[PDB]
Amino acid sequence: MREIVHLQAGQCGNQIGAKFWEVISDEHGIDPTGTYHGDSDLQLERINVYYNEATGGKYVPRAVLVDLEPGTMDSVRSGPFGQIFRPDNFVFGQSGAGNNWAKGHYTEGAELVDSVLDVVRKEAESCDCLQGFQLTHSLGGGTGSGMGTLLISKIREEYPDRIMNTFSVVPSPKVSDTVVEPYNATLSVHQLVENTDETYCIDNEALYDICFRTLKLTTPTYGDLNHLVSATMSGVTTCLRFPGQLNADLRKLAVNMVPFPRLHFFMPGFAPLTSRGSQQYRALTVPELTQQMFDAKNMMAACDPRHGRYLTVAAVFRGRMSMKEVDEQMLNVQNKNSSYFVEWIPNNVKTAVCDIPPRGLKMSATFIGNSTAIQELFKRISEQFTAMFRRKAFLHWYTGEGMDEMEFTEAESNMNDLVSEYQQYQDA
Amino acid sequence: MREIVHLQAGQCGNQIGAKFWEVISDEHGIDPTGTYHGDSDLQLERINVYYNEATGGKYVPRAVLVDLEPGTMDSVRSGPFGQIFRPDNFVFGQSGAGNNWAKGHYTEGAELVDSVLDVVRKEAESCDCLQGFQLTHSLGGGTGSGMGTLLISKIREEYPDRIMNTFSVVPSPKVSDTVVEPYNATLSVHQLVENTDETYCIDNEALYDICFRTLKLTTPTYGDLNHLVSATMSGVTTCLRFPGQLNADLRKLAVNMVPFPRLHFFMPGFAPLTSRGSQQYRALTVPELTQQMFDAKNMMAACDPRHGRYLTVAAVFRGRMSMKEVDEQMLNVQNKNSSYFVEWIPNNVKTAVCDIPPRGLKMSATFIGNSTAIQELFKRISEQFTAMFRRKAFLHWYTGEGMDEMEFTEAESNMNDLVSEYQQYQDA
Amino acid sequence: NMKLMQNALQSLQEETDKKKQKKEDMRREQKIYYQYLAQRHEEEKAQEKEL
Amino acid sequence: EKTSDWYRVSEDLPARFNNPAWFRGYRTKEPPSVYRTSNQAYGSRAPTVHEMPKVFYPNSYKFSRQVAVGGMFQNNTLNVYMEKSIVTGPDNYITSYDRLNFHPSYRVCRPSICD
Amino acid sequence: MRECISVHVGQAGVQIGNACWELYCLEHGIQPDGQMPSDKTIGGGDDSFNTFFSETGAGKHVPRAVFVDLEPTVIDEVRTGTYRQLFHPEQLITGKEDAANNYARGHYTIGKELIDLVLDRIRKLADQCTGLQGFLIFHSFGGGTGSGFTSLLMERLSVDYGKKSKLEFSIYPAPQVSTAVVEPYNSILTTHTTLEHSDCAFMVDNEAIYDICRRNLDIERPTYTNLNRLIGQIVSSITASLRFDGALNVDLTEFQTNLVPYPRIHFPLATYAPVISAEKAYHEQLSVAEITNACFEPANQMVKCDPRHGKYMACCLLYRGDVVPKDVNAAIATIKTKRTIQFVDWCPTGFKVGINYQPPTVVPGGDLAKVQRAVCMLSNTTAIAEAWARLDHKFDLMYAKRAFVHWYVGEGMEEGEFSEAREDMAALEKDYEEVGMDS
Amino acid sequence: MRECISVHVGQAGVQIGNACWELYCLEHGIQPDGQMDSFNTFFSETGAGKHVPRAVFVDLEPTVIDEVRTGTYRQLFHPEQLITGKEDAANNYARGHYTIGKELIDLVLDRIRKLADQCTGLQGFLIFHSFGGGTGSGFTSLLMERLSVDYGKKSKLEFSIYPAPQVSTAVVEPYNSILTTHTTLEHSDCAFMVDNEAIYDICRRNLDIERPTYTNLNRLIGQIVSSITASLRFDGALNVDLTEFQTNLVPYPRIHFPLATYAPVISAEKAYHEQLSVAEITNACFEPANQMVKCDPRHGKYMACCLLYRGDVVPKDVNAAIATIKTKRTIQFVDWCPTGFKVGINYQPPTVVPGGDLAKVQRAVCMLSNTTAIAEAWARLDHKFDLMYAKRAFVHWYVGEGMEEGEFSEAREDMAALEKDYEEVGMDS
Ligand SMILES: Nc1nc2c(ncn2[C@@H]2O[C@H](COP(=O)(O)OP(=O)(O)OP(=O)(O)O)[C@@H](O)[C@H]2O)c(=O)[nH]1
Ligand SMILES: Nc1nc2c(ncn2[C@@H]2O[C@H](COP(=O)(O)OP(=O)(O)OP(=O)(O)O)[C@@H](O)[C@H]2O)c(=O)[nH]1
Ligand SMILES: Nc1nc2c(ncn2[C@@H]2O[C@H](COP(=O)(O)OP(=O)(O)O)[C@@H](O)[C@H]2O)c(=O)[nH]1
Ligand SMILES: Nc1nc2c(ncn2[C@@H]2O[C@H](COP(=O)(O)OP(=O)(O)O)[C@@H](O)[C@H]2O)c(=O)[nH]1
């Protein structure tokens, strides 16, 4: 009865989320026409966490896809699994954001936010009990970061006790692809620290080093980097849909993880990621899966967490495994390494197991780490914002429609403390 | 149960290292794809020491191959057996080594020391216990010296208890393969004394000695020179690996040989060697085997054993053989001459006899011998190095690398005391 | 685990087939286009002489 | 005269770019005269099989028009929603309020309203 | 839906529009007489011509363009040339007697009789179609109607439309290569409207195109047809992300905010990198990382100013063809590695990247080659400040002896407008100074 | 990883980059069309299976470009590397460096900056020019001056033709061949000298071909430059490179002067006899009475000896033949090098070229020794610069564009100090 709603935001979220429904529907066994043709029997037993019913026994996914340009909605509808979405559930404006966070927060997107919520109140009416919403956006552009934030602060106010979850493409340090990035990213963390229950840091530079050094690909396009994120969003909530031993839902992973209510910026990673030459050479055992979770390469955020202590650590294993090999292997991390762990929590590890593996693997995991190294990309974003704002480099494109300048030095007030809050909890 | 991780570096380290795990897998009986090809079940007991059980009946090298130059990687993958090797265990650099220790140890060792050490810490952490360790590398060439001896010190901080060891190659002291190799080899063994626990050194002058006058086999290549080592350096770890009557570890032979843990310089060589013309004339008895390690007709390394006394000797064996004429042969070589043996300490030997011989040979053996003859090759180096340090020519390469002229004089006094240490242990 | 192994090798075969196809057909089409250049060049030279 | 014969193609290219002989509107290669003006050199030759585009990625808009005809969705309905139940049963129906609404198990000792 | 309107002014701008509308017609399937040539053959997935054409009732596509001239002879080659059956005959607006190298004629006394026509014909075009990304006009500095009527068109078109974007394309005089003695008097005095009333004003010199042809290509003696074909491949690369979809696409709004720091620094450059003779394209590679290192070479710029003297404020990169996104990010960090390529102290990000799947098309009879890859590098640079330093010196040297003034002052122009233009460009030589030093 | 990107400067440089690239392009299977990964050392790749050798054909005389291009190998050496000047420099360091040399740096910057992107890891630069000609002494000089500022520590070795003391081709050539090496001791790593009199000596008495052209002397340099950089390209018994002997043959940053000698110079009348043993071919290296610089070593210092080998090589006879060199004392003993050798072994035997000059060869060895014999035979050119700088000859064409008379004695004191330090190195250590 515990079901969720999958909002998609911006143009980066529509590459993530359109690949998200080609992974879930692979798992639940749905054709592109929307009719069940699957193998096993408990596979559609919990189909109602995500999907919905229609006439004649056809299943439609539930979502709402927003954009400020109409080009992406035609691209999603012409996708491989693009037939199953309802045509009422697409909402889109007519004039693009133009990489302007202020246009996508005040003048170009606020006409649309009164029409997305009419879709959302129609999908949240149909529930038995909502577990929480879900959003996918990008912290680099205009229409993912502005209006995708304006969805959050209005959904949270009118659904206050649901477990809001997000997935964020944090901008890169220096290998970047927009001139006006730090105005776009520092103005979004100001409204993302106080309105989200969990938020994930997805570097686009740690998502290339995976695709060179542990997968050894040749031409890593965007078609598979959407897939690496879309295996983690399936991996966190496998405990929600499928049975097992020591299940842990979308909410019970939040309670164990965030010790103080401003420190909810995580860093994920997926455990068996093996090069296709070395598929013959990996050994399927539980300890070999664990050394990939805590390896510094499979961190998928922008900072190496050996520069500090983990605060709390998750591990959502999937498959068939003895749960003695689960609870012993996490202990051997906390004793071999001791200085890299916070010592006023006597056990830093939450575990979970479910019995239904991903399609085509024996077992898989999903690492979640609330490391204290995440202050580092908060300094590098803030240092590239206090150099622009010394002499007002690009400011007149944002100021001219109604944003005064004091909402920019208010942002670093709500940003330079959050650099410090990781430092006081770094030690003693 | 006991496991072994392997670190391996450079070009000459790879060519010795590609042959080693080719002839490791002969007695383990491993497919050139990697699956089981055991002919008996006593040959499949502690194959887990070197191989991880990859699934399918598969087995992989627990071995890390690094190189800073990809132009000698193809000499390894295109070998007769080079399909076992895992591609994640390959990591390759873009900048050339430059046939230099200082470039390879300070400059280009700096970038990739964390990349190798995190992978080696990845593979060694999954051990229930690491029994022994090795490295195959050279001293006459750059990154085999540079990256070879840098990384022994970096794991030395993290893993100080487990036993590391060195299979090294002195460059040829008769005909040079780099002109100024007292700068390369002596600046790399200066790191190596406190880096490692023990040192195995074979030289090519003892290798060309055998095929000329003793084996009666003209035209040996580096595949013939790699056949007097790659069964030798698997010939000391026998009784741990294949079960025997008198089984011994790798650490415990390194425990029983000495009362004083200061010095460690060995010389490996394989015992059952006679000419293919004399293959049927000269297979008589186990006294014929013992009359090869003792005699210097077998030269193990370039140093001649007849120069000085032996503080100890050690003679391991594989295969079922007698006991009373083991007792006879250590007595009859004592009575006729006692100049090899020290006249103070009477007991020297460590006779570990196994049950399992290799295929094709019935009475196998390996000799590791401690005496004062390693002094001789360093003494003409102390006639080589002082001829070239009094003028300081090639040091103009070495000023700009990142070091001064005071590491040169200090490191030679880290060796010239050891020459004095050997010569007063030899006396009295 | 073995059926995963054959799926891996199948993807290797598909990749090398596609690479050799792209190399072969695009070099042939380049040769075709360059013969077209030679023909048009000689026609324009004859036009110059006629004028 | 058939560009899939001469060149390989992506199989979704339209027939206009497939068959180049239909572009009949271009100039007809008149032999030169002295009174040959220079601005007339623009577009003086028809395209041939070599110049047709190999691939084509145009932006269709049929779905976007046929969805955004009229107006976007907006809720103008009366407030219709059932407050659901916490327990999972089709017979057991309790909410935050009305916690005593369930089928009573048949107690033998007394009627069920007496505890 | 996502359209643009191309307004052409003057003899230089019309002969750009003879080259553009040849090249957009080749990019779609459109014949020179309209007539989408599909004949009883089914097709699905189209409408990539809404950005520059209009499908009418008979099935005949008519583009959105007005052609404005004050000269009769230039436009009447179109009315009798091959494309006569394509333009609507009201949209080839023709003047009667020309400006004859005169700002004062083209802005005060001759364009008054004609401005009532063009602003009726533009409003007919825009009311017809839904959205409007922005106009893309074409003009030239060194002539009368190219800089007079253009200075009157832009003052009137920024009032009654406003918030819809504009672009601007220019022909800028050389240091050496000039065609008129009136050239400095009107390339100084045309900046009273291309500062206030233009959102981006691109800059193209005749001299570098005269030199980029002799060095990359095996061509000598290139005429004006070969200059028009190159600038047709810029406008068909800025707007290529509107029509043909891509992995990372920039609209006309997107690169406007990533490229001009302050609202008086809207004078970017442009370069086209894989320019190569069709014999030489057989030879080299022209990779994904080859053609981005060529954008910053001083031999292959567009205005003859040394790029190794200024500091680059912003760069927008417009890639075209089969480009992968990992190879782009390998290229950019290599440029920031080299320390002779200079970026301003308050801009560590640096770049904006766009990628389209459509390959750059070929033109028949064109000396450009067929290459799978292309890029058009937009940049705002401090080195263009040193490009007015050879035009202010050619203006006050003229003005002190008062040569060639009596034509302007007799046509409704006052002498207080000459020296007012000189201070308004000597002010801008400090705006490009004051944002140059470090903090 | 193995790539020696080059650049040609000169009529001499492009004639050598014709007739050494004969053997370079017959070592691989590129017929002169440019069509069909050892090739990736030199040849780039297009998309469509076509190549460009990573080289630039810079020269200011406009004849050598057309004459090279009108050969068989027309579209092989592709025409955009072909950098042509309008008027030649004509024995003038001032023309070739200052008044015409500054004109084409903007071209050479493109054509050497774009080549760096197309290799995996760039090894270094071998460069081609000559000393008795002005534009081959000037652009090479200014090339090193700009490039070692911009890049720096990349490998830089020179190919050139040095005036042997018997015969020469220009009058005042000890001027222009002694000014241009004020930058080869600064911005480059090593230097090759090959005088053509030392090839005219050998091309009669080791191949029985009287009357040899310079295009026949352009192929024994090919039979050097094959085995020198060919060890990079093919996995031998020990895969040796050129940064290797960049380190190994340089004891001081002043004395980088190796001596090149290749073993198989035998006729088809002589090929009925040589057994191609390692002993006889290493004798054909280390008996310098028949080698490629005309200086007898019997007053020189026998320091550093790199020996490269191609073909049917056995290490036991290599280590017997280098030991055989160490037996006899007529090659004597330098003090501070006890052994000072290098063995390099490569498994592609060299290619016999049609239109070539000798018969079937199985075995190859080439030697580069550092020896002070030609360092003390530098004194002949050093002493006979003075006999023409006693009387102020030819200076007027030089001095007009920037060869002022101070530099003419600056180079003199700079290069007298070089001999004064040669004498102290030749004083026993
Ligand atoms: N790049 C480029 N510039 C051109 C071209 N044709 C003309 N020009 C430029 O146009 C300038 C002349 O200005 P115009 O716009 O033609 O002014 P005009 O039409 O002569 O003015 P009137 O004679 O009064 O009609 C010359 O200086 C050229 O630089 C062309 O085809 N390409
Ligand atoms: N061995 C050999 N020597 C050459 C070759 N080409 C030119 N030379 C030598 O070069 C010397 C003069 O030629 P260059 O050095 O090119 O002088 P140049 O012709 O003035 O040079 P540029 O003016 O730059 O073209 C003569 O001594 C020749 O011996 C060649 O192909 N092989
Ligand atoms: N991970 C991922 N990132 C993408 C993809 N497509 C675009 N991006 C990122 O999105 C950022 C810019 O996004 P943008 O298009 O401006 O998002 P928008 O503002 O919502 O339109 C860039 O940093 C890209 O790295 C994708 O398919 N996957
Ligand atoms: N026994 C043996 N010696 C080798 C092998 N490869 C190289 N060597 C020796 O390594 C020494 C120097 O070789 P070099 O290539 O310069 O060392 P590297 O650069 O570290 O690989 C020489 O004495 C060679 O005899 C091999 O496969 N086996």
Ligand SMILES: [Mg+2]
């Ligand atoms: Mg005009």
Ligand SMILES: [Mg+2]
């Ligand atoms: Mg010349």
